[PDB]
Amino acid sequence: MRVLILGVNGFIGNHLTERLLREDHYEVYGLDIGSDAISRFLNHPHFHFVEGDISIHSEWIEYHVKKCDVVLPLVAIATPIEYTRNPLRVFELDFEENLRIIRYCVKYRKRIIFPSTSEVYGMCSDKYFDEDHSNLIVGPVNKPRWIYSVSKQLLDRVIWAYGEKEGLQFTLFRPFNWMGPRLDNLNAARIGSSRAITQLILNLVEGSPIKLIDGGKQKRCFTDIRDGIEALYRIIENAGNRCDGEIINIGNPENEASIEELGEMLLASFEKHPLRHHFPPFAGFRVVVEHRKPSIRNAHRCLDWEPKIDMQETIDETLDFFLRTVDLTD
Amino acid sequence: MRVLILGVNGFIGNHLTERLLREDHYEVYGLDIGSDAISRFLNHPHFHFVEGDISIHSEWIEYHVKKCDVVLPLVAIATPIEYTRNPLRVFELDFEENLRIIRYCVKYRKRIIFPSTSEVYGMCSDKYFDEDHSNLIVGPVNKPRWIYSVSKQLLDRVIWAYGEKEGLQFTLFRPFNWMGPRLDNLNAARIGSSRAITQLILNLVEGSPIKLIDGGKQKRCFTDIRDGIEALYRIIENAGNRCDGEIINIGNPENEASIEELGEMLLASFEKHPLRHHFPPFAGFRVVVEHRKPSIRNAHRCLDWEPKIDMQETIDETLDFFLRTVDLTD
CATH class of the missing domain: 3.90.25.10 (UDP-galactose 4-epimerase, domain 1)
Structure with missing residues (x-):
């Protein structure tokens, strides 16, 4: 199983790579523009560092999608001030460049494990945000902070549509404040911490x-990263194919x-x-947003997981x- | 004043073109793949038919944006069954291809008059949908009917961001069930009827x-098209520049x-x-969606308009x- 992590040089990349290398049947391809956060895996026989940038490369990323079996795109800007200071760049990177990677998976019939965001629920009034039932609530267009939330949501819908219409195999996940060792820097364009x-x-x-x-x-x-990464690891394992087409909040309510x-x-x-x-x-x-508590029934059901x-x-x-x-x- | 209408061969194109040609200072460039709905303007000295398709052409549309002063992109699929039967095509045309046209306006510093949709409010509980204050409410990602609403909303936010960051001059408008003579065919990818x-x-x-x-x-x-088109005509006139950066519901509540x-x-x-x-x-x-009544205070204020x-x-x-x-x- 060849796992392609785009934006490996960070928190999730580190902890996920550690986990997959414990198991004997994973080859990890970690794509990034630097390797300082993961330099201790560079010599590992089943880790493969790949030079790259999802805004610059077309063919190189496309290649690595074809070469691999499952893909985890972790490159996105989720810095709130940036939503208002640099909204176009947030849109271009988080939406447009990730959409290209989605379409590579569709084209080469690869599985995608995509980090949606807990911000998609917005000002939802349910006490427990439910992936399958909660309405998504955002403000008017004159409140530009919502551009990140709505870009990510539209990307989910596009993934969903590829799944319905084009047989894309996907799982969407929503992390809720994962934390532990090796946190991303505050301005790194990598999802997870x-x-x-x-x-x-x-x-x-x-x-x-x-x-x-x-x-x-x-x-x-x-949510402790040991709990979070365990869940993500189970999504990768996909016992019984029970994660197919699923949307899974991963947090500790x-x-x-x-x-x-x-x-x-x-x-x-x-x-x-x-x-x-x-x-x-x-x-x-x-x-x-006054509360942001996940429902984790989907994770209970699909992954047999609890924090x-x-x-x-x-x-x-x-x-x-x-x-x-x-x-x-x- | 050179007005570029993309998707002129329909309801809005017809009624708008009639209105602008009454006035002596408009040159109308009507872009489309056919002309049967507007064939009686083809010989008019101040109407200019332009062959085109916003999914096929790059440079030809770009040219016509540069040549013109104001741009009205009316090409979009808003057929509900299509949101679920052909979601990718709805997304590609309504979002991606219109985004290119937006970026042409940004690049050549042209004014854009963009048809947002009343569907952006979704299941908003306000009795009067307010462009500047109402929250936007959609269902989960597993309810794919919302892909149209959310694509259009994200496009609004992107326009808004270009306006804030890049000096794009825009007005957004939201028609509420305009009706009259020369209705679009039910499966025409043209906004308005x-x-x-x-x-x-x-x-x-x-x-x-x-x-x-x-x-x-x-x-x-x-909303009668005589009322609707009067409002749109005033947005084009833009007395006092009062429509700059505005979002305007056009309907009769x-x-x-x-x-x-x-x-x-x-x-x-x-x-x-x-x-x-x-x-x-x-x-x-x-x-x-149980009710869909517009607030029209923005139209009152900016256009001095009422139905x-x-x-x-x-x-x-x-x-x-x-x-x-x-x-x-x-």
Whole structure:
């Protein structure tokens, strides 16, 4: 099984590649423009680094789709300010360039495992966002923050249509704030790591304040990467072909917190940490979609999966690794 | 003022071209693959027929964008069954090919007047759909009927972004069931004529039944083309530049009826018509988004416009012209 990861040089690429290389029947083709995040797999016999950029290359990516069996496109900009500061580039990369890769899979009859986004639900009023039943709610066109949500949704619909009409084999997945070791940088155009926890950990690391937009009462769910990657690994395995044509939220709905509470949890774990003294004093909380909890019935059904790691162990492990790998001279 | 109408060979093309040629300072370039719907303007000195197809041509359309001042792209498939039977083609034509035309306008700094759709609001619960304030509500990805609505919405957002970031001059308009003489054929890929009234008039003309999907209690608003085209003409005139960056619903919110009532109104006007005897007996009502009423404050503000024709005169005029131009030997 040849697995093509586009945008391997990051969080998901790292953790997914580790997982697949444990198993004896995977060849991982990791496409990216750099390899610093995964440099320890470069010498692995079943890892294959592929030089590339999905905006520049046509034929090279197309080739690698043909060569491989399953494809995971992880290249996208999901930086909120960018939705308003550089909307065209968000659209071009996240929509147009990924659409080309989708069409390569259709053409060579390959399976695609596509990262949809939890942002597709928008201001959905269900308490549990359900992939198969929840209505998707966005604001008017004069609220440009929604361009990312709606681009990703239209891409889902296009995948769905290729599936219905052209026999594309797909699974869509929606990560909810995955977190752990080897988080993407905040401005890396790679899907997967919780931007909210990376930002907060960054605040503590830099000694900048934690912004609570309107008191930080908006609630989010957070998912350990060990749980998340286990689910994604099962989607790849696709026991019984039970993931075919499915849309699967992957998150831990019991790991719910407002940004305020997430703030306090991180701070507690931080102040307790043996390396805390390398970092500045706490600059403080700064007052400047109200809920986003996944239904995980689809993951229960298709993957026989449920999350095993509590909030506190994921927080602690995520923070610990981040602090330990910070370069203190830079 | 050189006005480029892409998809001129239809309802809007006809009525818009008539209106602009009344005025002495318009040159109309009407692009299409046929001219039967507008053949009486072919000899007009200020009308210019342009052979073309927005899926086939690149450079020829690009040229005509450069040559002209304002552009109205009216080519799109808005046939509901097609959203589910041929979703990819709906996406390719309505989204991808229109996006090319948008980018030509951006590049040559031309004004674009773009037909958004009333379908963008989806299952919005406001009683009056408001371009600037109403949330847009669609179903899950497993409800593929929404691919049209969401493609059109993303196109609006992309136009909006070009406007914000690249100085594109645009106005977006949303027609609500425009109707009158020279209705598009039901399967013509040209925006503008109410598919609901064309279908019903067709039922009466053919002697097929009128389908009331779940009793036909869903309510719609209907707009005489004389009112609609007057508004569109004012958007073209753009007095005070008051339409710049605006989104404008064009409909008559007082012309509200369920499909059932629209049915009965048409039937009454039909049975009363002097040419009714050329058509079969009434095959009957057949039981097989609940409201879609526009806010028109933007049209009031920008265009100083309000609709002048009552339901009954538009119904009567629309039916009368349709019946009179039917070819009874075919």
